Design a binder for this molecule. Structure first.
Ligand SMILES: CCCCCCCCCCCCCCCCCC(=O)OCC(COC(=O)CCCCCCCCCCCCCCCCC)OC(=O)CCCCCCCCCCCCCCCCC
Ligand SMILES: CCCCCCCCCCCCCCCCCC(=O)OCC(COC(=O)CCCCCCCCCCCCCCCCC)OC(=O)CCCCCCCCCCCCCCCCC
Ligand SMILES: CCCCCCCCCCCCCCCCCC(=O)OCC(COC(=O)CCCCCCCCCCCCCCCCC)OC(=O)CCCCCCCCCCCCCCCCC
Ligand code: HEA
Ligand code: HEA
Ligand SMILES: CCCCC/C=C\C/C=C/C/C=C/C/C=C\CCCC(=O)O[C@H](COC(=O)CCCCCCCCCCCCCCCCC)COP(=O)(O)OCCN
Ligand SMILES: CCCCC/C=C\C/C=C\C/C=C\C/C=C\CCCC(=O)O[C@H](COC(=O)CCCCCCCCCCCCCCCCC)COP(=O)(O)OCCN
Ligand SMILES: CCCCC/C=C/C/C=C/CCCCCCCC(=O)O[C@H](COC(=O)CCCCCCCCCCCCCCC)COP(=O)(O)OCC[N+](C)(C)C
Ligand SMILES: CCCCCC/C=C\CCCCCCCCCC(=O)O[C@H](COC(=O)CCCCCCCCCCCCCCC)COP(=O)(O)OC[C@@H](O)CO
Ligand SMILES: CCCCCCCCCCO[C@@H]1O[C@H](CO)[C@@H](O[C@H]2O[C@H](CO)[C@@H](O)[C@H](O)[C@H]2O)[C@H](O)[C@H]1O
Ligand SMILES: CCCCCCCCCCO[C@@H]1O[C@H](CO)[C@@H](O[C@H]2O[C@H](CO)[C@@H](O)[C@H](O)[C@H]2O)[C@H](O)[C@H]1O
Ligand SMILES: C[C@H](CCC(=O)O)[C@H]1CC[C@H]2[C@@H]3[C@H](O)C[C@@H]4C[C@H](O)CC[C@]4(C)[C@H]3C[C@H](O)[C@]12C
Ligand SMILES: [C-]#N
Ligand code: CUA
Ligand SMILES: [Cu+2]
Ligand SMILES: [Mg+2]
Ligand code: NA
Ligand SMILES: [Zn+2]
Lengths: 514, 84, 41, 144, 49, 73, 104, 46, 227, 93
């Protein structure tokens, strides 16, 4: 029974639970890697005495946090648990293929571990650019194991995208149009379309890297007429959609959380929120070269990519202002999930504004490959994603488990994390403006003060992560079972009780046309 | 394909109105900006009486026979050069 | 939300034990590695 | 009174200031005297006593607005505990400094810094605003 | 009836704040951390060549 | 002993929003005149004052005499 | 639609002689979503609906929701109670304050 | 069928809170410890 | 170079970097307008017990909050693009210098007239002379004439690197098989520092750039003495 | 042409065949079609089939509302949408 249920699953809730457990474990790995980064930088000099190892830690930090923590939690965990419930569907369209999307991830993560254990690791950056990642500067198996890890994670997510698009298009009640589905469901559909289109381009690029390393191709090698910059275009043609894939489900969850704890039946400006996510999805394919402003790019191309990148703040702003308009007039409930969502709005706004600074290619010349970029994305993406994940985890933990958290402990956890992440990343703006490069294991002495503060911040967030594990333990240890949940008339995922039965919507909802 | 939308479900009138106002007319507005920024008169080039240009094998059937139909004196030289 | 009182209440002492064990589980192995870094180098 | 897990699909009671009249009464079963009180409520309410009026309220509702909207001392626990755990973090940082980190480079010795500062002034580092702009080359001291 | 916050909130706030300030002031000043502040107004420049 | 006057009862949230959005606007204006003055304008003046009578050869000779250069003793 | 037109539709709603319990609750739970404290004339109609429905407790709760809707505008509730005293006396409705239900 | 309800829709037991603490300790502690041991491993090869 | 506790950009060494500072100040004035506006508005939404939970009509306010951001973006874009096209303007260099990245050092070639080339490596910390800067000095500086337009050509003989000098607003990737051009003009003599800015392996943190800007006549005699 | 290819009438089975035969009779036991609303008064409630004693209703109270209002409808007296008041009555079994 245990194997049938948990290794042979065809159930969207159990698969969602598997993804949440996997993603929480990966988040411990990715946090430990981030603390090694900050320990190496927390005083001047060398800590590891091996900067190849430092570079391997940085590279694996980003792959773990992106491919094994955020994407599995947002899309595999919250998407599988919540999407079918929010449309009244009995499961996903392809419930068995869904289980393979999950089970490809432990082997993908094993390949990434393997890459770091063999030879000297892949000390490449998560961009994996050649020729550093080629077979002369990274001879041996580490980079190929990293490529294969990415291939498996890509297949997992492409099949998952197929599943989500199909389920959301085909399995709603017959009377429910796409403009009657909740915003989280929209955010997953759009994320899935971005995955479907972008991950095959990454797969092509990393396969060309694999063949340059092992089959004597020269896609990226000038000796054969190849070009390192071609790899960067293929990588970033995926990688820009990827940053929106990482945040879009978070936007969906934030819309639900802000609406719920405002005591509202609906988000402000629903169609504008759909418009904004669709626009971000579409424009997310035409801006990638802003990751390449220093490669030797012609001025008119720089001007185009600057302008297209600026156009994206418009639909993103409709979403920030619409979250503020949802709060307006609300019966505000200061629950821990609401605190996470308000933290998200603040931090995402800070990070999006420093992205606007970066969009100007002339300023980006001076800021590229410095800690100002690291500060932009740890606000707008890394901590935007983590605060939306924690808001959604706190808000929906009683649905998934049937038990309540201790809200006082959850508010203490939020307070510690908010101090920690701001102490960690805010000073990195100053480091970047004053010229400290990213991807460095040590720094000229002038940069000591802000690196020291940033590293002390990183230990505050460690304390918060340890406390989060205790908080989850205390909830399962005390077994406070949920009774009543407010606002079920506009939050269908709760209407089957906590936790919902294994099969839900065996009799579908009744929705008429009128 | 290299898009980024979603909806499908049904493509009805509401969806096509959404596309008209949410994508098509904003695109026209942006290209109208792009265009009404690169507007302006550049410096016209030296006249050179190249024999493959300003072709005259028969007089035009209007005016003096030597001016094209949408002749612009500022930018269109005659076979003998710009007009005064 | 409303909920039942705990089926298996976790007293302050029990929470101090769970918190201490949780923190030690993260701190002791990493602390051992970092304390011995120069030994590895 | 007693809400059961198996009742999740039935209309439920809630105390929320934005939903003043919930879908069910707080107390559905009535004793003999409570039945008699509901019969008496069918006559002039001027004939009910204060205690009878309170009892009718408490059959219909669990908490009053003043009770459901009460502020609490929770903030003290939250802020105090957050500061405790931030304080605990500095213990970790003290441990790290003592047992993990070795000496920093010799360039942070006071005499090195003093010579390096003079050399930065001799090369006029940031002479418009940032650094040398703050040195008085004529008086040979930091601008006051 | 008084809850945990009524009974202990004042002590948790006072002890947590006192402890946090004390341990961070100790860490910042007593264990040899080099913050490397600006020399401006602090360092007397010395001949180097 | 006296009746209470009828107060405003409708639109209290919208009224509060209207008043403070204005205050929010006039604070951003009051700030930008300050940030321009305390930062942006200060910087324009610092650079123009610095370069107004700047003598690059004199700066060089000072640096050379201080011993900083590889190419000039 | 004018304020008086709004007030008059709401007065008419609660004055329906055979208004049922569901309609009473739907009306009050909808009304409190709007950005206003209901005029005394609306509250009067609702309280008399409570009387027709033999529901003393809902009459008291309606007075509480008036005080709550006024937020920090502490002058509104005492004015509304003043305006309702003849109805309160007529129907024997005690205020929440007279019942002690304003204490925490 | 399968068990449903709180504590039953998960691949780990919560029947005993102390056994649960051990299991959660090993689970999250193994993920957090792994990078430190990988670093140790790489340093010990030189 | 940067100095301890610096918050913003290094002081400008070239007119282009001065332009960037003024444009960054502009962008920041706007950034601070928007940030404080958002903070003030969100705080306002969160500080009243008054409520309004019925459906709110959206279209009016969505016009304000699309059109205002679009205007702001145009107010950033216009000066941004002007600087971009100004940096692109031909300037007619007096000298061309090549730099080739390597793991982990830079080489320089000055081959307009004579075959002058050399390697430039970080000074190890143990060998710094007193008052020299850890991780920033090199053995052989890039001596250049001050007050003159210089074409730098940047490439690599192995992996990617990136040649950067923040106080001159310069960062050009060094790509094997490619010859990227940038121009440099220092308004002042002195020593201007940068660091390799594309991760290139284990010693990426330790291959810095030091420009030494001097009068033409000293550059000429230095060049001759380096043959 | 020739023959030799089975038809659905000949060879469909299981649930596919159930759906096919019901459609021929104009029935929809597997809920493939959206039900059409009645006037939804207490006299003419929307009739909600169920194989049990409760079913979730979603009410799109006005055409083109994006918010759907969801509630359990139980066997017994008709219930009303909590947003618009339209009536629904369960027709079990
Ligand atoms: C639905 C409500 C919840 C919603 C909330 C979501 C929950 C999330 C927060 C709530 C969090 C509560 C956490 C509870 C701890 C779960 C412990 C567990 O034992 O999980 C359940 C286990 C089975 O264990 C049990 O059944 C224990 C109870 C009964 C079993 C009897 C024997 C006990 C054996 C010892 C246990 C060992 C524990 C692990 C020890 C681990 C040692 C390694 O199985 C499974 O299905 C595994 C599930 C997926 C695991 C994904 C991570 C795999 C990462 C590795 C990738 C490989 C390469 C890494 C290498 C890469 C490096 C670079
Ligand atoms: C209010 C303006 C917020 C605007 C900012 C938005 C962005 C940030 C989100 C950040 C989220 C803002 C949280 C605002 C506090 C809400 C007070 C409240 O009415 O709470 C509800 C009341 C109960 O009240 C009622 O009964 C009805 C009201 O609960 C209580 O007694 C205690 C509530 C404790 C909350 C303290 C959390 C502080 C975390 C802040 C991060 C730094 C921590 C530094 C701790 C010290 C570290 C050294
Ligand atoms: C954001 C989260 C913030 C969390 C930590 C908050 C602390 C920052 C305090 C709260 C934020 C204020 C920023 C302080 C910047 C000082 C400055 O004038 O910086 C100038 C420039 C460079 O300028 C120069 O040419 C040199 C400047 C002159 C030096 C003289 C000193 C005068 C200022 C002293 C600052 C001391 C160091 C602070 C060290 C701080 C360490 C954490 O630096 C920069 O560009 C930094 C660019 C960061 C981009 C931020 C995006 C929007 C965030 C604003 C917060 C939202 C609402 C506000 C109000 C926010 C209230 C919550
Ligand atoms: C969640 C992930 C995420 C998200 C959403 C974003 C969003 C944005 N990013 Fe960021 N970005 C990253 C993750 C993300 N980014 C990562 C990981 C990298 C580096 C990769 C690497 O090199 O490893 C990076 C790097 C990166 C660069 C390259 C810098 C460099 O390498 O030198 C640039 C350049 O233009 C950029 C710009 C932006 C912009 C303009 C947005 C916009 O989408 C933001 C829009 C949001 C707002 C603007 C705020 C809300 C709006 C308002 C309140 C309205 C009014 C606003 C205005 C009028 C401006 N990003
Ligand atoms: C989602 C993405 C993500 C996240 C979350 C993080 C989190 C952190 N990052 Fe991240 N980081 C990157 C993505 C991310 N990072 C990327 C892409 C790079 C660039 C790599 C390259 O240059 O190639 C990078 C690089 C980078 C650097 C620069 C390295 C260099 O340039 O040399 C630094 C430096 O301080 C840093 C620090 C941190 C810290 C201290 C944290 C965290 O410790 C902050 C606090 C957050 C947590 C503690 C998260 C906990 C969440 C969980 C545990 C999940 C729980 C799950 C459930 C409850 C279901 N990161
Ligand atoms: C606004 C967008 C354009 C809208 C249309 C405007 C009018 C164009 C009419 C289109 C007819 C197309 C026939 C094409 C003939 C040439 C016209 C080409 C378009 C045009 O209008 O060209 C103009 C020349 O017109 C000239 O000669 C004079 C042209 C007038 C005489 C045309 C006579 C010939 C018509 C023959 C048609 C035969 C069709 C047979 C169809 C049989 C199918 C079975 C260009 O002006 P220009 O000053 O030289 O340069 C501009 C300098 N500033
Ligand atoms: C230079 C680079 C070269 C690279 C290599 C080039 C290769 C090109 C490849 C060519 C592929 C060729 C054809 C294969 C065709 C198979 C499609 C099979 C399905 C099918 O054929 O059925 C169609 C289904 O329609 C339907 O609604 C389908 C609905 C699908 C819904 C998906 C929704 C995803 C989100 C979209 C949102 C958009 C919002 C704006 C019927 O359409 P048709 O009129 O017959 O036209 C087919 C045209 N090719
Ligand atoms: C980079 C910066 C970019 C720019 C940012 C710009 C922000 C601009 C923000 C605009 C602020 C001003 C908007 C003011 C709206 C206030 C609504 C209002 O004025 O009134 C409410 C209107 O409701 C209705 O129709 C519909 C409900 C209200 C419709 C509007 C909803 C309010 C929206 C508020 C948004 C606040 C958050 C803004 C975040 C920026 C109604 O209340 P009443 O009880 O009187 O009705 C009863 C009416 N009877 C009695 C006559 C029938
Ligand atoms: C370097 C080398 C790396 C190698 C990595 C290899 C990784 C994966 C190993 C793959 C093992 C494949 C095993 C067969 C999978 C069949 C999936 C399938 O056919 O899935 C179907 C759904 O997908 C559909 O239709 C449409 C989708 C069909 C997809 C079939 C599988 C494709 C796998 C690879 C494709 C990757 C994309 C490449 C382009 C980037 C059916 O869904 P189920 O839920 O099962 O059933 C539903 C029931 O109602 C059916 O009665
Ligand atoms: C970034 C994540 C890491 C964050 C901070 C970790 C904080 C430290 C927790 C304590 O870790 C322990 O520290 C001991 C020292 O205090 C070590 O004992 C070591 O030192 C002792 C004292 O000298 C000897 O008794 C032991 O045998 C010797 O192993 C011990 O191994 C290690 O488990
Ligand atoms: C999952 C992470 C697994 C980490 C395994 C590390 O193993 C270490 O490798 C070292 C060699 O470099 C050995 O010497 C050491 O004894 C061993 O423990
Ligand atoms: C037409 C469409 C859907 C309306 C509906 O059927 O409900 C709506 C939804 C979002 C709207 C857009 C957003 O509100 C954002 C922009 C707002 C500007 O005021 C007009 C253009 C603008 C781009 C809007 C055009 C149009 O009214 C949109 C696209
Ligand atoms: C961001 N890209
Ligand atoms: Cu060379 Cu980095
Ligand atoms: Cu991007
Ligand atoms: Mg780069
Ligand atoms: Na270091
Ligand atoms: Zn309805």
């Amino acid at each position: 029974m245990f194997i049938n249920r948990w290794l042979f699953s065809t159930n969207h809730k159990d698969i969602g639970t598997l993804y949440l457990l996997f993603g929480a474990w990966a988040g411990m790995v990715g946090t430990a890697l981030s603390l090694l980064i900050r320990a190496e930088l927390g005083q001047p000099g060398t800590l590891l005495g091996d900067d190849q190892i430092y570079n391997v830690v940085v590279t694996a930090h980003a792959f773990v946090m992106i491919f094994f923590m955020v994407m599995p939690i947002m899309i595999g965990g919250f998407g599988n648990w919540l999407v079918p419930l929010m449309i009244g569907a009995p499961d996903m369209a392809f419930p068995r293929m869904n289980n393979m999307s999950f089970w490809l991830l432990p082997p993908s993560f094993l390949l990434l571990l393997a890459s770091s254990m063999v030879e000297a690791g892949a000390g490449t950056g998560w961009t994996v650019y050649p020729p550093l990642a080629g077979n002369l500067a990274h001879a041996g198996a580490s980079v190929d194991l990293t490529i294969f890890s990415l291939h498996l994670a890509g297949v997992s997510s492409i099949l998952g995208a197929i599943n989500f698009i199909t389920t959301i298009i085909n399995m709603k009640p017959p009377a429910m149009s796409q403009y009657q589905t909740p915003l989280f469901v929209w955010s997953v559909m759009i994320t899935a379309v971005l995955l479907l289109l972008s991950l095959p381009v990454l797969a092509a690029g990393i396969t060309m890297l694999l063949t340059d390393r092992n089959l004597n191709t020269t896609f990226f090698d000038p000796a054969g007429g190849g070009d390192p910059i071609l790899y960067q275009h293929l990588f970033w043609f995926f990688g820009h959609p990827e940053v929106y894939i990482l945040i879009l489900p978070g936007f969906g969850m934030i819309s639900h959380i802000v609406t719920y704890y405002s005591g509202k039946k609906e988000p402000f400006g629903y169609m504008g929120m759909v418009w904004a996510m669709m626009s971000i999805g579409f424009l997310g394919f035409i801006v990638w070269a802003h990751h390449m402003f220093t490669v030797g790019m012609d001025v008119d191309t720089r001007a185009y990519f600057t302008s297209a990148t600026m156009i994206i703040a418009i639909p993103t702003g409709v979403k920030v202002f619409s979250w503020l308009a949802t709060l307006h007039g609300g019966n505000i409930k200061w629950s821990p999930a609401m605190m996470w969502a308000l933290g998200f709005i603040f931090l995402f706004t800070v990070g999006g504004l420093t992205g606007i600074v970066l969009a100007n290619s002339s300023l980006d010349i001076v800021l590229h490959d410095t800690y100002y970029v690291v500060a932009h994305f740890h606000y707008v993406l890394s901590m935007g994603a983590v605060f939306a994940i924690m808001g959604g985890f706190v808000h929906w933990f009683p649905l998934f488990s049937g038990y309540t958290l201790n809200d006082t402990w959850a508010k203490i956890h939020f307070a510690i994390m908010f101090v920690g992440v701001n102490m960690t990343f805010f000073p990195q703006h100053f480091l970047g403006l004053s010229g400290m490069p990213r991807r460095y294991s040590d720094y000229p002495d002038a940069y000591t003060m802000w690196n020291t503060i940033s590293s002390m911040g990183s230990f505050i967030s460690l304390t918060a992560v340890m406390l989060m594990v205790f908080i989850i333990w205390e909830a399962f240890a005390s077994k406070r079972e949920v009774l009543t949940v407010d606002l079920t008339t506009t939050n269908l995922e709760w209407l089957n009780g906590c936790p919902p039965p294994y099969h839900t919507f065996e009799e579908p909802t009744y929705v008429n046309l009128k | 394909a290299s898009a980024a939308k979603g909806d499908h479900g049904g493509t009805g009138a509401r969806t096509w109105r959404f596309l008209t106002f949410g994508l098509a007319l904003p695109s026209v507005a942006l290209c109208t900006l792009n265009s009404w920024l690169h507007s302006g008169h550049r410096e016209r080039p030296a006249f050179i009486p190249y024999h493959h240009l300003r072709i005259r094998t028969k007089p035009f059937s209007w005016g003096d026979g030597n001016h094209t139909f949408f002749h612009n004196p500022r930018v269109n030289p005659l076979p003998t050069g710009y007009e005064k | 939300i409303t909920a039942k009182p705990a089926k298996t209440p976790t007293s302050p002492k029990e929470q101090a034990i769970g918190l201490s064990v949780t923190f030690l589980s993260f701190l002791l192995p990493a602390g051992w590695v970092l304390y011995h870094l120069d030994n590895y180098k | 009174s007693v809400v059961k897990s198996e009742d999740y699909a039935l209309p439920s009671y809630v105390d929320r200031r934005d939903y003043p009249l919930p879908d069910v009464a707080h107390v559905k079963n009535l004793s003999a005297s409570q039945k008699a009180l509901k019969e008496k409520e069918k006559a002039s309410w001027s004939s009910l006593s204060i205690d009878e009026k309170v009892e009718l309220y408490r059959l219909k509702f669990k908490e009053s607005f003043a009770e459901m909207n009460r502020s609490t001392n929770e903030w003290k626990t939250v802020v105090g505990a957050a500061m405790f755990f931030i304080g605990f973090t500095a213990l970790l940082l003290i441990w790290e400094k003592h047992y993990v980190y070795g000496p920093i480079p010799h360039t942070f010795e006071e005499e090195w810094v003093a010579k390096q500062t003079k050399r930065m002034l001799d090369m006029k580092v940031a002479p418009i605003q940032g650094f040398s702009a703050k040195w008085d080359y004529d008086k040979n001291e930091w601008k006051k | 009836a008084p809850d945990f916050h009524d009974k202990y909130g004042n002590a948790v706030l006072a002890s947590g704040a006192t402890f946090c300030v004390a341990v961070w002031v100790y860490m910042a000043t007593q264990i040899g951390i080099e913050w490397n502040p600006s020399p401006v107004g602090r360092v007397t420049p010395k001949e180097w060549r | 002993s006296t009746a209470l006057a009828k107060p405003q009862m409708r639109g209290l949230l919208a009224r509060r929003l209207r008043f403070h959005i204005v205050g929010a606007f006039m604070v951003s204006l009051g700030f930008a005149t300050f940030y321009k003055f305390a930062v942006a304008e200060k910087r324009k003046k610092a650079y123009a004052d610095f370069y107004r009578n700047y003598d690059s050869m004199k700066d060089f000779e000072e640096m050379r005499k201080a011993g900083i250069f590889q190419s000039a003793k | 639609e004018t304020d008086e037109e709004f007030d008059a539709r709401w007065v008419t709603y609660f004055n329906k002689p055979d208004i049922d319990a569901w309609e009473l609750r739907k009306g009050m739970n909808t009304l409190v979503g709007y950005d206003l404290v209901p005029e005394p004339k609306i509250i009067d109609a609702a309280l008399r609906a409570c009387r027709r429905l033999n529901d003393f407790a809902s009459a008291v709760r309606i007075l509480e929701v008036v005080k709550d809707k006024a937020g920090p505008h502490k002058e509104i509730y005492p004015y509304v109670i003043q305006e309702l005293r003849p109805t309160l006396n007529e129907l024997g409705i005690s205020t929440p304050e007279e019942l002690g239900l304003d204490k925490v | 069928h399968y068990e449903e309800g709180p504590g039953k829709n998960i691949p780990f037991s919560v029947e005993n809170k102390w056994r649960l603490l051990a299991m959660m300790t090993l689970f999250f502690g193994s993920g957090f410890a792994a990078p430190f041991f990988i670093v140790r491993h790489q340093l010990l090869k030189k | 170079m940067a100095y301890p506790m610096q918050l913003g950009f290094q002081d400008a060494t070239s007119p282009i970097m001065e332009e960037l500072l003024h444009f960054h100040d502009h962008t920041l004035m706007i950034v601070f307008l928007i940030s404080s506006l958002v903070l003030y508005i969100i705080s306002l939404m969160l500080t009243t017990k008054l409520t309004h939970t019925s459906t709110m009509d959206a279209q009016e306010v969505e016009t304000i909050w699309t059109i205002l951001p679009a205007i702001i973006l145009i107010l950033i874009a216009l000066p941004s693009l002007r600087i971009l096209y100004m940096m692109d303007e031909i300037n007619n260099p007096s000298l061309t210098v090549k730099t080739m990245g390597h793991q982990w050092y830079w080489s320089y070639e000055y081959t307009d007239y004579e075959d002058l080339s050399f390697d430039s490596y970080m000074i190890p910390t143990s060998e710094l002379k007193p008052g020299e800067l850890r991780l920033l000095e090199v053995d052989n500086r890039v001596v250049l004439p001050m007050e003159m337009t210089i074409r730098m050509l940047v490439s690599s003989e192995d992996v990617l690197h990136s040649w950067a000098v923040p106080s001159l607003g310069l960062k050009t990737d060094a790509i094997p098989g490619r010859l990227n051009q940038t121009t440099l003009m220092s308004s002042r003599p002195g020593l201007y520092y940068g660091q390799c800015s594309e991760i290139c392996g284990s010693n990426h943190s330790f291959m810095p750039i030091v420009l030494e800007l001097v009068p033409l006549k000293y550059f000429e005699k230095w060049s001759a003495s380096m043959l | 042409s020739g023959g030799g290819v089975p038809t659905d009438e000949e060879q469909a089975t299981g649930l596919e065949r159930e759906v096919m035969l019901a459609a021929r009779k104009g029935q929809d036991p597997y809920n493939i079609l959206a039900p059409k609303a009645t006037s939804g008064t207490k006299e003419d409630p929307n009739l909600v089939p169920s194989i049990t004693n409760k079913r979730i209703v979603g009410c799109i109270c006005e055409e083109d509302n994006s918010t759907v209002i969801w509630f359990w409808l139980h066997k017994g007296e008709a219930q009303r949408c909590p947003s618009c008041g339209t009536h629904y009555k369960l027709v079990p079994h």
